[PDB]
Chain A
Amino acid sequence: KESYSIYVYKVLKQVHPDTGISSKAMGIMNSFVNDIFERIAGEASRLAHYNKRSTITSREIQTAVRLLLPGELAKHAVSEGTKAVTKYTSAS
Chain B
Amino acid sequence: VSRSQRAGLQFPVGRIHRHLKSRTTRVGATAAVYSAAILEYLTAEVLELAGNASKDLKVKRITPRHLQLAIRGDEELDSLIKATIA
Count of chain A to chain B residue pairs whose CB atoms are closer than 8 Å in the complex: 187
Total chain B interface residues with beta-carbon distance under 8 A:
58
A42: contacting residue among B6, B19, B23, CB under 8 A? B23
A22: contacting residue among B38, B62, B85, CB under 8 A? B62
**Residue pair A40, B35 in contact (C-beta under 8 Å):** yes
Give the chain B neighbours of A58 by CB distance below 8 A: 28, 30-31, 33-34
Give the chain B neighbours of A28 by CB distance below 8 A: 64, 67
Interface residues of B (CB under 8 A from A): 1, 3, 6-13, 15-16, 19-20, 23-24, 26-31, 33-48, 50-51, 54, 59-64, 66-67, 75-77, 79-81, 83-85
